[PDB]
Amino acid sequence: MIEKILLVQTLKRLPRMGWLIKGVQEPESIADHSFGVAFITLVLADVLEKRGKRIDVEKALKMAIVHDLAEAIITDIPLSAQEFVDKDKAEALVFKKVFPEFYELYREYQECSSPEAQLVRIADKLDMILQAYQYELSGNKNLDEFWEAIEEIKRLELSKYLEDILNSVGRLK
Amino acid sequence: MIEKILLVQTLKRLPRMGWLIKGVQEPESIADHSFGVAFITLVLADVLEKRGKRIDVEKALKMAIVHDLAEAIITDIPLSAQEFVDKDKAEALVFKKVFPEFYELYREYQECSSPEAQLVRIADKLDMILQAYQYELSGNKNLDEFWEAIEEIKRLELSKYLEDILNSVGRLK
Amino acid sequence: MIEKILLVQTLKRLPRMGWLIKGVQEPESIADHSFGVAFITLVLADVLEKRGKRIDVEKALKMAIVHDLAEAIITDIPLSAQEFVDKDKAEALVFKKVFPEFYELYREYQECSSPEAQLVRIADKLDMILQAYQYELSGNKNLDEFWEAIEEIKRLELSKYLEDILNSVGRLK
Amino acid sequence: MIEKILLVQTLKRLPRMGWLIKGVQEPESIADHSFGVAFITLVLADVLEKRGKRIDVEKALKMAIVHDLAEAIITDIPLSAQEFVDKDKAEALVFKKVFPEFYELYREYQECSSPEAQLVRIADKLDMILQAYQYELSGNKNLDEFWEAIEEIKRLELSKYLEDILNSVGRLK
Amino acid sequence: MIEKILLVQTLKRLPRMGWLIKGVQEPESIADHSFGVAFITLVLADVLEKRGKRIDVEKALKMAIVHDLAEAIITDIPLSAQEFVDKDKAEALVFKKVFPEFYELYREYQECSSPEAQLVRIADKLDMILQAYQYELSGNKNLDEFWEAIEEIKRLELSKYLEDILNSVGRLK
Amino acid sequence: MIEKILLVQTLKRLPRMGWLIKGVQEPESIADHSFGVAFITLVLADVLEKRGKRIDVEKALKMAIVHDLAEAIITDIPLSAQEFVDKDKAEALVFKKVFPEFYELYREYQECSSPEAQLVRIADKLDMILQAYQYELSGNKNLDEFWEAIEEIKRLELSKYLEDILNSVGRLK
Ligand code: NI
Ligand code: NI
Ligand code: NI
Ligand code: NI
Ligand code: NI
Ligand code: NI
After folding, report:
1. Taking an 8 Å Cβ-Cβ cutoff, which residues of chain B contact chain A?
2. Residue F113 in contact with residue D115, Cβ under 8 Å?
3. What Enzyme Commission number(s) appear in the record (chains A, B, C, D, E, F) (predicted)?
4. Which of A48, B46, D12, F104 is deepest in the core (most CB within 10 A)?
5. Could you give all domains of chain F from N- to C-terminal order, each with its CATH number?
6. Ligand nearest to the CA of E76
7. Which of D24, D7, D28 lies closest to D74 in space, CA to CA?
């Protein structure tokens, strides 16, 4: 339906708030980010494929495309604000009322248990670490917490199959 | 303290979300909006003064300067998102923890009972309405809803002393 | 590999040129556009699914994700410029030199024969038509031509299953 | 009156020209700046309050709100340009013709003699210094001059009560 | 000298203020404008050549390039502000102290007597009118006044040779 | 003709793509760049004049104004993309079909043989180098390659007369 699409297209206009709070001049939109997660999810899926780890690619890509979809209505409430706002409670609600067809993908994603759910989570973090890397090259000097994003990925089983990649990333540091 | 000032200066960086969601190019920041509320509050207290309506101007101006201060942390969570997000609960928390010295000003502003409180509330809406007016001249054609804030103002006792001004405003549409 | 991902991420920075030439302020990025294509592809896929038309969703989503990938190097050369530049020849080249793993998806996409290929093409054109619609609500009045993409969609067999939707779209103008 | 307010709101749209000349991407508007001045003035007034220095806060806040009001018409003519244009003479004129009701506040502010006038001047400069600080964190490296405004503040009697604070500020450099 | 060139390049960063005041969000820079004046000057000069009117093209092109050069220091102070600021006085000063080598071109330009001086003045106005045209297509609806510059052009002798063109321009409204 | 002028005015809207790819936030337009080339060409012409090297200044200035004119149609296709696109072939075509009157100024410029051709080429690069310099002051740290344009300049005979200037430029790095 046209009304749903027009709604999700608001993501092209919504900024990724963390960057603004860090003084990043023209930050990427939530949609730019979502594209990045989707692409990294695709690329990583192939790597996992040829390393013996089988992944339900379809589910993965759908999960990457829809993972931040609730923000089309509640916006990318930054982590710094989440000490005062329950963004999680809000997301579930929106998915249950506005995006019921995607609530299963959302629910599984939050659980971060399945191979697909962990992949998207890793793609989410990599797009960010690497986006931070870019903004650093642009001159921003307060993109400080990366050893804890890298470390957050390391805490996921699925990372075991990607250690060499995550090593190249931390090497950009 | 410098830390606090640096924190509130974030307002210059955070956009007024309602405009973004409506597709407005280069929307004003929260600080831009706050200045306007501060000015209109000044001007309107002036008018109330010479019409026999007693106003604690000092408290009013303070209230106007601090009214959206919590957003320095939680951002300008749009109305469209407040169906899933309790923004007011979040604001009270930030004020209680991060701006305890302004909690009472905030608390009185939320109650919208006292003359000062309703004045700032009226200034807040007028800035917005007049801002929607300006963006329409820029070419945006979906800010229509914003003009029903005139009716919200009319439901406040204090507006009884400003009727004339509210109608000039409505005539701008 | 990190080098590939960083490259594709350039898409978040490159603008969709047609909008600039038409004078739109702050035009979407190629990545914004791609995300949209990917979402519409998802949504339409499931519409086709429960209408008897079988779609290899995995291939479709992958196809939508990488359809404009060559632009990460070529940039979104506008249609007005393609009378002097062979964007098609340049794309193919990028894809078999830089993106050989995606050359098949690209090649099938260009042929616009398979159900998936036509679906992505339709997603591509709808995102744009709907994007033009949004910019018009912003005030831009010379995006008229963009609406004749509805006819371009009608010329594809797969649209046969979407007539009701296409009607709602054209109804927006 | 609506016309006046609409005029003052022009400040949301005008840049603070010093940043532009120095190459800063998206510089704050004059209204962004004013709000900061108003806030710092509020904060500093409380500090002065509990340190034995009585301040007429109401006048101080009005003064901060109105201090750059003439730029709504003349724009924030940069210091580098003032060697060829008498901004001061321009400001007074705009204030007597267009803002006669704020001329006294402006006149006192320019004299920088009274406690309130020096407070607002101190707020004006702290906002700027802190703003320069923020832009340096974004990568701009030619804002060094802006830091010698600490010395300009030291030359004001009122600073005597704020030694500790301006120490912390110069410490940020 | 490098210092001079770096100074004039500031024109790439400074906005043409009239547009900002009128609410046009991403206004051209003074350098954008100057390039247009230079191009129109070139184009018209050729038309004038084929029409019997001989022009000192070299002088005209230099005059077009240098005409707003003083703004590199004084900024494009808007017409609405020139009721309170003598922009002309300031311009001559800059040219005398900073651009002595270009003072003659400036002086002759302001006199608007010679064929070259009038040509640049016409070019200056045409770029502006055509620029207002483009911003109206973008949705701005308060640039009406800018069209009365066609009349200002008619008052110049040289226009006599360009009637047909001025008609095509006025026809765009 | 009004159609031609409007076309070339597109240059004000089109970004210089190299900067974008490098992460520069607000890049200069092609028009901004052309103005700078036009100014530097003027300034250097005078220098050459008083050093015994005679230059057809009229041709030089015309050549600097239209040197990147084809980009009004094909855009500023970056150097990084030219391994896949033949920008040169594309430019010549546009000039032959759309700018026939400026074709020989274009062809001479490309040959980089005549004093005027080499002067514009040197202005072209100097503007870029100095533009790179400015962006580095803004915080961008990956513009290093752009400084090897000094060596490209040295390869042109005409530079023999400018050694001292080139030394001041390289001195800025
Ligand atoms: Ni995400
Ligand atoms: Ni508010
Ligand atoms: Ni596409
Ligand atoms: Ni100020
Ligand atoms: Ni001009
Ligand atoms: Ni060039």
Report:
1. 10, 13-15, 17, 20-21, 23, 73-75, 77-78, 80-81, 83-87, 90-91, 93-94
2. no
3. 3.1.3.89
4. D12
5. 1-173 (1.10.3210.10)
6. 5
7. D7
